[PDB]
Design a binder for this molecule. Structure first.
Ligand code: CA
Length: 279
């Protein structure tokens, strides 16, 4: 299935080269998979979600996304126009307030929530969680991400936007989850993207068009934007069978475009998420 004039990041994920604008993907499109977006929430009413999104948890006075960030990330995972996995089910977990902030204790509670909550959902092809958030190193935050992964969820987390080694950030520094750096449309490491040994993969992160609150759309940049490309990719590959929650990060690394990114520091993987779809 070809989507013409797709956002550059979608086109990139199904291409052996930069500079194209059509996204190619198997029509199964993540059907039967689920992706949790642990963030500021998701505007489920957005026409782009087609009824496939819903809020399942909040730690605040509302489950509404009053920020937009969570809605944008969810759109990159699974919206009809802006999403990687256009038929996945999206579950919003609001651990961040409308200012985009959240206490680590609330974020941890949200991760443990997902590990249990998946047992209340129908996800026969598998379960993914996208965590476009982070802060300074915390063993407790890392451990929560590790538990979520251990429980049978493909956990994708943002490397961070500090142009620094991600070893000093959490959950980025957790070895057992999939830590995602950001690239731009010219295959350069995004200027803000963290790097380091803890990174597992890069995805499109600069100038990413997706859904926004109030039924709108906008382009923003961050490792927050790269992460949902990888989460959506995992969901897509899981419905194809190709991989499982426990092996998806390795599989994505195995099958990535290799050595094609510029300004990757010595010691950081040079791997760009790729669906290996042959139309
Ligand atoms: Ca790792």
């Amino acid at each position: 299935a070809a989507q013409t004039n797709a956002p550059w990041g979608l086109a990139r994920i199904s291409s052996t080269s930069p500079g194209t604008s059509t996204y190619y993907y198997d029509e199964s499109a993540g059907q039967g998979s689920c992706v949790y977006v642990i963030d500021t929430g998701i505007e489920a009413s957005h026409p782009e979600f087609e009824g496939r999104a819903q809020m399942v948890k909040t730690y605040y006075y509302s489950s509404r996304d009053g920020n937009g960030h969570g809605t944008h990330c969810a759109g990159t995972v699974g919206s009809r126009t802006y999403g990687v996995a256009k038929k996945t089910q999206l579950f919003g977990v609001k651990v961040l307030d409308d200012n985009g902030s959240g206490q680590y204790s609330t974020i941890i509670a949200g991760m443990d929530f997902v590990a249990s909550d998946k047992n209340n959902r129908n996800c026969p092809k598998g379960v993914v969680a996208s965590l476009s958030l982070g802060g300074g190193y915390s063993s407790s935050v890392n451990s929560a991400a590790a538990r979520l992964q251990s429980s049978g969820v493909m956990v994708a987390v943002a490397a961070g936007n500090n142009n620094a080694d991600a070893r000093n950030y959490s959950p980025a520094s957790e070895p057992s989850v999939c830590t995602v750096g950001a690239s731009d449309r010219y295959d350069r490491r995004s200027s803000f993207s963290n790097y380091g040994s803890v990174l597992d993969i890069f995805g499109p992160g600069t100038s990413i068009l997706s859904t926004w609150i109030g039924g709108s759309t906008r382009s923003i940049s961050g490792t927050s934007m790269a992460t949902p490309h990888v989460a959506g990719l995992a969901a897509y590959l899981m419905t194809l069978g190709k991989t499982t929650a426990a092996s998806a990060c390795r599989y994505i690394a195995d099958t990535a475009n290799k050595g094609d990114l510029s300004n990757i520091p010595f010691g950081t993987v040079n791997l760009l998420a790729y669906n290996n779809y042959q139309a």
